[PDB]
Every structure is written in C-alpha cells, then in structure tokens.
C-alpha cells in the first residue's frame, strides 16, 4: 500500500523523484527547511520512493500505535548526510552501526534543519553541495538520553523490557531525537542545497 | 496474519508455550539439538509467540523472497545466550549492538550456529546460578551469503562497483557453512527456547 502522492514506478521498488518547484509538495518541504535555513539555496528536493523501507516502517508504525494505545508517534525531522552515504541511506535507510553520541549509540535526527545544516553533519562535497533528509521518525514516547545507551531506557525499572521509543536532549523542549532500531526512520525527502 | 498452530493469545502480543515430549514439534527440535549435543539433557522447550517480531520478520522474508531468484533464504539455526539476556530476546529479538565478539570474528553482527554443539559452549550458553543453559532455535534470513571479515558492520557488496547491493549475511566458509552473521534487525525470529543441563 504505497502512498497515493508517490508517482508510478513502472513496477520497480526504488525511485528518487525530483519535485517540481512551486507545486504544493515542494513548497511544503521547502518551508520546513527555510523555517531555520532561509540563508541557504535549494538546488533540488527529491521524494524517496523505497517500497521495502516504507513497508518495514509502516509495520513498526502500526505496532507502536497499538503499543502506545494512541497515535502521534511520528515526527518530521532532519538528518544531514555526507554525499558518500546518500546512496546507502536512499536504499537502506538509517543504520546505528555506521560525531557526538552524547545521548546514546543510535541514529540522530534534528528538530531544526539549521542543526543538520552544520558542515559536521551535511559535509559540503567537491562543489559545495550539502545533503539533508526530511525523515519520518517514530519518536513515540521519549525520555532524556545519556552516553553509552544501546537501546532506550525502560519506562519503569519494574518491567525492564518495556522501553521508551526514543531519547532526546531535553523532554520539555527537544532539539534532537535518537532511535536505536532499524525501520523507526523513513527518509522521505532529500534536499540538495548550498551555503 | 499469525500462524494457525500458535495457541490463542486472547488479545496478548507475547506468549511462551511449553511443548510436550512425544509431539512432533518437540521431537524434531530435540533431534536437531541431540544431533550434536547428546552429552546434555533438555529440561524443556518453549515455543516463542511474539506477534510484533513475527510480523517484522515475515515482512523481511517476503522482501528477500522477492529480491532473490527463487532462493531458500531461511535456515533454522542455534543461538546460545545467558539467562540475563532471555527476557529482552523473547520480547525484542537479537540486537547486534548487544552482541559479544566471537572467538573467530567474521563481522560485528549477531552470530547463529548450524550445530547446537557450538551454541552449547559455556562462552555462549552461560550456565545460570542453577546450572541451566539456554539456547534459541532461530529462523534466520541467510539469503545469499559470502565469507565474512572481522571489519564488517554490514554485509559486503556483491559487486565493488555497486556498493549498496549487499549480500544478505556472511559465513565462516561458503563451502561448509557452520555459522552465519546478520547485521539488521528483524532478520532473525527466535522461534524456540531450549533450557538444558549437563
Ligand atoms: N546528521 C545529523 O543531522 C545530526 C547528527 C547528530 C546530531 O546530534 C549529535 C549530538 C549529540 N550530543 C549533542 S549533539 C544531530 C543531527
């Protein structure tokens, strides 16, 4: 059940689709970016259509929706990426096994594109082109992280296997989220931009 | 969606079911185990009914069954572990981020053995304070595999000029595989827990 707004893939399972500037989808994603990165120039925005990653992600979403016995498990966040990792992420998504890991050994996502836009996360390539994903993340129920976590903490130490879904730097006002499991993050758009 | 031979879980997502000796299900696992561990005695065999793990695993199997060319992508393998790890594995499966370094490393992933005798080593199935050893019997998506290397954090590419098109798993020896390493969540379903003693 591949989303309606995806465009036909001629029976293929992976496609990157360049969005048309000035149409609704492009304008929505651009506005999420320019909220904090209005000094940056957008060269292009690509929709990531990865059927297998989507399938695996949607399964985890339906599971977290049952487990948490409410919705609102999903946030739209940013991930800066070096050019050399874009093909792997487009195909395979985010892998904790591949910077500061102060809040645990998981994959990091920023609330603000400005954070992911730092050269440390979105390293300029030969031509000064920077790369950042807009990511559907299953943040679910979250707590403050700490160094050395390999999974989120338990919600209550009396049930050590019933875990928080993610961790953050700050629970009242989060600026980053860490997830510790494959298929808790779906890379939805890739933004190619310059300083 | 859940297999029809599973006991009714009411509306529950998790259950361990104690098997009865004389049942074909118990006897096939005991025989698989005793093939290489006839020195040990089985206390009990539990069927693991974990709906969420089962769902995510079956999705990965369907994807690998589509991607690969009529391959048998699944092997039934062994995994020894310590008592302290059993409640987490039962609920959340095998986490590569928790995995011990193997005496012979073919990569940084989760290790599964062809032979129960390998998993039965005290290094993997550590005797608990009561002298009970624990070994999972695990459906593993081995898929298309190659000989691993200690540096790996993901399976290697099949083709060095196509770095994102990966082997599904790695092994110690492609001619005579005795262990498999997987590097992704939901590539292994813990199906049975064997509790055993000397
Ligand atoms: N790739 C990214 O966009 C990215 C990477 C790392 C991020 O946080 C790392 C930190 C850990 N402790 C404090 S900062 C945020 C975003």
Swiss-Prot record, chain A:
Entry keyword annotation includes Cell membrane: no
GO terms under cellular component: cytoplasm; nucleus
Domain of life, per lineage: Eukaryota
Record keywords, A-Z: Glycosyltransferase, NAD, Nucleotidyltransferase, Nucleus, Repeat, Transcription, Transcription regulation, Transferase
Chain ranges of the PARP catalytic domain: 2-195
Places the protein is found: Nucleus
GO molecular function annotation: NAD+ binding; NAD+ poly-ADP-ribosyltransferase activity; NAD+-protein mono-ADP-ribosyltransferase activity; NAD+-protein-aspartate ADP-ribosyltransferase activity; NAD+-protein-glutamate ADP-ribosyltransferase activity; nucleotidyltransferase activity; transcription corepressor activity
GO process annotations (BP): negative regulation of gene expression; negative regulation of transcription by RNA polymerase II; protein poly-ADP-ribosylation
Family, as annotated: Belongs to the ARTD/PARP family.
Functional note: Mono-ADP-ribosyltransferase that mediates mono-ADP-ribosylation of target proteins. Acts as a negative regulator of transcription.
Protein name, entry field: Protein mono-ADP-ribosyltransferase PARP15
Full protein: residues contained: 481 to 678 of 678
Curated annotation (Swiss-Prot), chain B:
Domain of life: Eukaryota
A Gene Ontology cellular-component term: nucleus
Cell location: Nucleus
Predominant localisation class: nucleus
GO-annotated biological processes: negative regulation of gene expression; negative regulation of transcription by RNA polymerase II; protein poly-ADP-ribosylation
Keywords associated with the record: Glycosyltransferase, NAD, Nucleotidyltransferase, Nucleus, Repeat, Transcription, Transcription regulation, Transferase
Signal peptide (from-to): none
Domain PARP catalytic: 2-198
GO molecular function: NAD+ binding; NAD+ poly-ADP-ribosyltransferase activity; NAD+-protein mono-ADP-ribosyltransferase activity; NAD+-protein-aspartate ADP-ribosyltransferase activity; NAD+-protein-glutamate ADP-ribosyltransferase activity; nucleotidyltransferase activity; transcription corepressor activity
UniProt record similarity statement: Belongs to the ARTD/PARP family.
Function per UniProt: Mono-ADP-ribosyltransferase that mediates mono-ADP-ribosylation of target proteins. Acts as a negative regulator of transcription.
Official protein name in the record: Protein mono-ADP-ribosyltransferase PARP15
Organism: Homo sapiens (Human)
Lineage: Eukaryota, Metazoa, Chordata, Craniata, Vertebrata
Residue range from the parent sequence: 481 to 678 of 678
């Amino acid at each position: 059940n591949l989303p309606e707004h995806w465009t036909d893939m001629n029976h293929q399972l992976f496609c990157m689709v360049q969005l048309e500037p000035g149409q609704s989808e492009y304008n929505t994603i651009k506005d999420k970016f320019t909220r904090t990165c209005s000094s940056y120039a957008i060269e292009k925005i690509e929709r990531i259509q990865n059927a297998f990653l989507w399938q695996s992600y949607q399964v985890k979403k339906r599971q977290m929706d049952i487990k948490n016995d409410h919705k609102n498990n999903e946030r739209l966040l940013f991930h800066g990426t070096d050019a050399d990792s874009v093909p792997y992420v487009n195909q395979h998504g985010f892998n904790r096994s591949c910077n500061a890991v102060s809040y645990g050994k998981g994959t990091y996502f920023a609330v603000d594109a400005s954070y992911s836009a730092k050269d440390t996360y979105s390293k300029p390539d030969s031509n000064g082109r920077k790369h950042m994903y807009v990511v559907r993340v299953l943040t679910g129920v979250f707590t403050k992280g700490r160094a050395g976590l390999v999974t989120p903490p338990p919600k209550n130490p009396h049930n050590p296997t019933d875990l928080f879904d993610s961790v953050t730097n700050n629970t009242r006002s989060p600026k980053l989220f860490v997830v510790f499991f494959d298929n808790q993050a779906y890379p939805e758009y890739l933004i190619t931009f310059t300083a």
